[PDB]
Amino acid sequence: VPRKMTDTELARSIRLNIEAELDAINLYAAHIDATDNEDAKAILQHVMDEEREHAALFWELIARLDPEQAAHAKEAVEKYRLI
Amino acid sequence: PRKMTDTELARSIRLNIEAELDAINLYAAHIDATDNEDAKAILQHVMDEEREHAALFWELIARLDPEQAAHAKEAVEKYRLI
Amino acid sequence: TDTELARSIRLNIEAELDAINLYAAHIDATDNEDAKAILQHVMDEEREHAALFWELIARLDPEQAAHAKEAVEKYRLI
Amino acid sequence: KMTDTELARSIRLNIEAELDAINLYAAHIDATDNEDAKAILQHVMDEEREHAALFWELIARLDPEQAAHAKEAVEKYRLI
Amino acid sequence: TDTELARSIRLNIEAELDAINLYAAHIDATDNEDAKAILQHVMDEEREHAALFWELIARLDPEQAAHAKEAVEKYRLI
Amino acid sequence: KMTDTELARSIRLNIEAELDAINLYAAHIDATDNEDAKAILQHVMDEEREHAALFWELIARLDPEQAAHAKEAVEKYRLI
Amino acid sequence: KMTDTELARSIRLNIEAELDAINLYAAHIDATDNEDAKAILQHVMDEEREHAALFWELIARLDPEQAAHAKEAVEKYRLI
Amino acid sequence: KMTDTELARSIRLNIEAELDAINLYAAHIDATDNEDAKAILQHVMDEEREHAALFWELIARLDPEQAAHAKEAVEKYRLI
Amino acid sequence: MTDTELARSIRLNIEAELDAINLYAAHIDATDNEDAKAILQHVMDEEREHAALFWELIARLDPEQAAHAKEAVEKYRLI
Amino acid sequence: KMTDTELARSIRLNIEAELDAINLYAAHIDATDNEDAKAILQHVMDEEREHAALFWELIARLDPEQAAHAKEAVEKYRLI
Ligand SMILES: [Fe+3]
Ligand SMILES: [Fe+3]
Ligand SMILES: [Fe+3]
Ligand SMILES: [Fe+3]
Ligand SMILES: [Fe+3]
Ligand SMILES: [Fe+3]
Ligand SMILES: [Fe+3]
């Protein structure tokens, strides 16, 4: 019940939406290499790229809330930081 | 890892229509479960784009081995049901 | 009128399509004729069901304006 | 397989799927108050019932024996 | 009267059929005859159980008028 | 040489399925007020119990060693 | 219900859970040839088996009857 | 594979798993009044967030297109 | 066939032990019987012993126990 | 409960989930041969192991008895 309506409910829900978008992109990535039709493959790459933009959009929202966005700012330094 | 023109192509696209609509229902539930405006905006945006994804997969099954002859008497047989 | 009605009809579309896929998997799992033929009949009827639920959800509140530009988005790729 | 461990078990599962679909449509008749939705739910449920009965006719004269469904209406009779 | 009793009995039919499917899958994975015999016995009893549930759900609520015209729709494809 | 994870484990699964069926039907006796449903539920549930007992007696002789279910009556009695 | 579907359902679930754990440890015994794993997995399997037998005696003193689980040793030989 | 099938899809799945862990730990933050547990939970949740950020930058620095990380900040402001 | 065939399996066995303890505890806290409570708490104690045993097994195996030497200090290192 | 099932069982679940994360990354080490992936996966797996150790002492440095985890090194040695 103690939920500021906006500061803690939709955050778990939008992380869920990120997960769902990512799984959908995974399925379309599995399906690009599963036929030799060219138009179907093309429309699948289009929908896959659009879902990819969805994932980026939900990610950029999920960063700018009460969770810590400095972790997704210290990521470019921590990537190369492994030797 | 597998290639077939009939089921390995059609069954998967029928599944994809289900997946698009699952996303649509989930998004519609997320529109009606908060009062955020940024979240509402990005959710209705993503929801409308999946609505295009679902319509496109519906044309894929139409322009596939399945028959778009079901979608020619459907507007009348809905009306043929009262 | 909403999830009470719309989410349930989306779900019924999933169920119809799942029945078509399952019966198609059972048709491509034999080379008989009795099961194949009557399963083709049940498959055809399931497909009609899915089309019917699709026209209903179009003729309800939601925006089927994607199913008006779907014929143009199919044609637009060659 | 294809008749022993496959087809009949798979067709039993097909009957199972028809029963589940009808269960969903019957729950959906009384979970809204629309008339168009009510009409098409009853219509699709009727056709599903046709599907389930016909799959039952297949399983009767398929590998399983249609002698069990016939010596059961009297075992029901055991309720008064 | 609805999904709590009748649909639940349809669920019971589902459970009977799945139990028969599992026991039949277990009969076709060995040639030990003692297990095969008791498994086939239990399966025959499950089969009568499932038939019993089917005739009850015919009487409880939904219409078995398809289950009177089912041999009639079976015959139409030969 | 599989009578272990091809014969015995399968019977553990069969006991699991029987017990789950008994639990499901017992939930179905406690979810309505009908007599006919009561009659068929009590009949089929008792027969399922018989099935579970049959599978248990099968698993006793198949593989595992029943040194516990002969020494078990003392561990219940060990208090109260 | 409580004693019928809170007491009995819970202990049948306990038997099922014991069976699931035993099946998992048995699958892991035949999925390696290590000696530490074999020894400790067989030990844990022995203790789970003890747990399962004890849960079975618990359900004996509940809603199921040994009127079938005492006629199971007599009914096994008469089935082939 | 090790570039497309098993590499890009797998890293997206790992991102999903880390996000599920973050959501779970946030649920455990809102279900207690312990402060040592709260502290370790916000620390581990932050570390999972660090994992999610790292996996996101890798999947960007992989085959997939990081052009969304140039477009999304403009397409979000465009939403009212 | 030495790491992910066995180590994931031993972690899974630990998972089963943990779920068994949680389920047993939920069934101990669902009645006011003492025979069932006592023997179920006993079985839970053996489940705890099992989880402990598998944990010591995984320590002398492929994963790194370098966390279990400074973990008592990083636990306290939070105030 | 705030201490029994709302706190303790949740921590049992959290340890289970951390083991799941390490297991998934261990499955992913056996599904590719890239070096960027190996580096970041080893980092996140090492951090997950740290998480699991932290939750293990939290459940240990609680009211339940870490006395099984004080005589474990002796009872395994009792296994051959
Ligand atoms: Fe999307
Ligand atoms: Fe989608
Ligand atoms: Fe249908
Ligand atoms: Fe049965
Ligand atoms: Fe049964
Ligand atoms: Fe155990
Ligand atoms: Fe146990």
Residue type, B76: V
* Tokens, residue D51: 């599907």
- Cβ-based contacts of I75 with chain H (< 8 Å): 40
- Nearest C-alpha in D relative to C22: D14
DSSP-based three-state secondary structure for D65: strand
Which of E7, E28, E55 is opposite residue D5, by nearest beta carbon? E28
F40 touches chain D (CB under 8 A): yes
Q: Does residue I1 lie in a domain region?
A: no
Q: How far is G44 from chain I (nearest CA, A)?
A: 6
Number of structural domains (chain J) is 1
Q: Give the mutation candidate from A37, A43, A47, A50 for the C interface (greatest C CB count, under 10 A).
A: A43
Q: Evaluate whether F53 touches G60 at the Cβ level (below 8 Å).
A: no
| Cα(F12)–Cα(F16) distance, integer angstroms | 6
C34 touches chain E (CB under 8 A): yes
Q: Does residue J73 lie in a domain region?
A: yes
F6 touches chain E (CB under 8 A): yes
Instruction: Measure CA A43 to chain center.
Output: 20
| Cα(B50)–Cα(B21) distance, integer angstroms | 8
| Alpha-carbon separation of residue E14 from A33, H41, J70 (angstroms) | 38, 44, 49
Q: How far is the CA of H59 from the centre of ligand 1 (A)?
A: 18
- Note whether C41 contacts E77, CB cutoff 8 Å: yes
Q: Does residue E1 lie in a domain region?
A: no
- Cβ-based contacts of J58 with chain H (< 8 Å): 36-37, 40
Task: Give the CA angle between residues I20, I23, I26 to the nearest 5°.
Answer: 150
- Cβ-based contacts of G50 with chain I (< 8 Å): 46
Contacts of J36 (CB under 8 A, 6+ apart): H58, H61, H62
| Cα(B76)–Cα(C52) distance, integer angstroms | 10
Q: How far is A27 from chain H (nearest CA, A)?
A: 8
Report, in angstroms and rounded to the nearest whole number, the Rg of chain C calculated over CA atoms: 16
Which of J11, J20, J40 is opposite residue H58, by nearest beta carbon? J40
- Note whether C60 contacts D36, CB cutoff 8 Å: yes
Q: Does residue B2 lie in a domain region?
A: no
Q: Does residue J66 lie in a domain region?
A: yes
Q: How far is the CA of G22 from the centre of ligand 7 (A)?
A: 9
**Nearest CA among C57, C58, C70 for reference residue B58:** C70
Backbone angles phi, psi at D61, to 5 degrees: -110, 40
Q: Evaluate whether G40 touches I54 at the Cβ level (below 8 Å).
A: yes
| Cα(F49)–Cα(G64) distance, integer angstroms | 8
Q: Evaluate whether J41 touches J26 at the Cβ level (below 8 Å).
A: no
| Cα(H45)–Cα(H24) distance, integer angstroms | 9
Q: What one-character DSSP code corresponds to residue F5?
A: I
Alpha helices in chain G (DSSP H): 8-29, 35-60, 72-77
User: Would the CA dihedral through B15, B16, B22, B25 be positive or negative?
Assistant: negative
Q: Does residue G1 lie in a domain region?
A: no
A 10 A CB-CB count for D32 gives 18
Report, in angstroms and rounded to the nearest whole number, the Rg of chain G calculated over CA atoms: 16
* Tokens, residue I75: 């636990």
Element (H, E) at D13: helix D7-29
Residue type, H20: D
- Cβ-based contacts of I39 with chain F (< 8 Å): 75-76
Looking at chain H, the number of H-run helices and the number of E-run strands are: 3, 0
> Residue C27 belongs to what domain range?
6-75
Contacts of D63 (CB under 8 A, 6+ apart): D3, D4, D7, D8
H40 touches chain I (CB under 8 A): yes
**Nearest CA among D80, D19, D25, D30 for reference residue D55:** D19
* Tokens, residue D52: 């389930």
DSSP-based three-state secondary structure for D61: strand
- Note whether B7 contacts C24, CB cutoff 8 Å: yes
Q: Does residue A2 lie in a domain region?
A: no
Q: Evaluate whether E5 touches E38 at the Cβ level (below 8 Å).
A: no
C43 touches chain D (CB under 8 A): no
Residue whose token pair is 């039993």: D12
* Tokens, residue J68: 């099984």
Backbone angles phi, psi at B20, to 5 degrees: -60, -55
- Cβ-based contacts of D40 with chain B (< 8 Å): 78, 81
- Note whether D78 contacts F36, CB cutoff 8 Å: no
Q: How far is the CA of H76 from the centre of ligand 1 (A)?
A: 14
Exposure string for J25-59, b = 16+ CB within 10 A, e = fewer: bbebeeebeeeebebbbebbbbbbbbbbbbbbbbb
D34 touches chain B (CB under 8 A): no
Q: How far is A75 from chain J (nearest CA, A)?
A: 11
Q: Does residue G50 lie in a domain region?
A: yes
- Note whether D65 contacts E73, CB cutoff 8 Å: no
G78 touches chain E (CB under 8 A): no
Exposure string for B27-38, b = 16+ CB within 10 A, e = fewer: bbebeeebebeb
First to last CA, chain E: 38
Q: Evaluate whether A55 touches H67 at the Cβ level (below 8 Å).
A: no
Task: Give the CA angle between residues I20, I25, I28 to the nearest 5°.
Answer: 125
| Cα(A74)–Cα(A66) distance, integer angstroms | 17
Backbone angles phi, psi at D65, to 5 degrees: -100, 125
Task: Give the CA angle between residues B8, B9, B15 to the nearest 5°.
Answer: 90
- Cβ-based contacts of H40 with chain I (< 8 Å): 75, 78
Q: How far is the CA of E23 from the centre of ligand 5 (A)?
A: 9
Structure method? X-ray
Element (H, E) at B39: helix B37-62
C78 touches chain A (CB under 8 A): yes
Q: How far is the CA of E52 from the centre of ligand 7 (A)?
A: 38
Q: Evaluate whether E32 touches E55 at the Cβ level (below 8 Å).
A: no
Backbone angles phi, psi at E2, to 5 degrees: -95, -135
| Alpha-carbon separation of residue A26 from B43, F29, H20 (angstroms) | 20, 45, 17
Contacts of D30 (CB under 8 A, 6+ apart): E2
- Note whether F80 contacts I34, CB cutoff 8 Å: yes
Report, in angstroms and rounded to the nearest whole number, the Rg of chain D calculated over CA atoms: 16
- Nearest C-alpha in A relative to H70: A56
Give the bridge partners for I20, in sequence order: none
| Cα(H3)–Cα(H55) distance, integer angstroms | 15
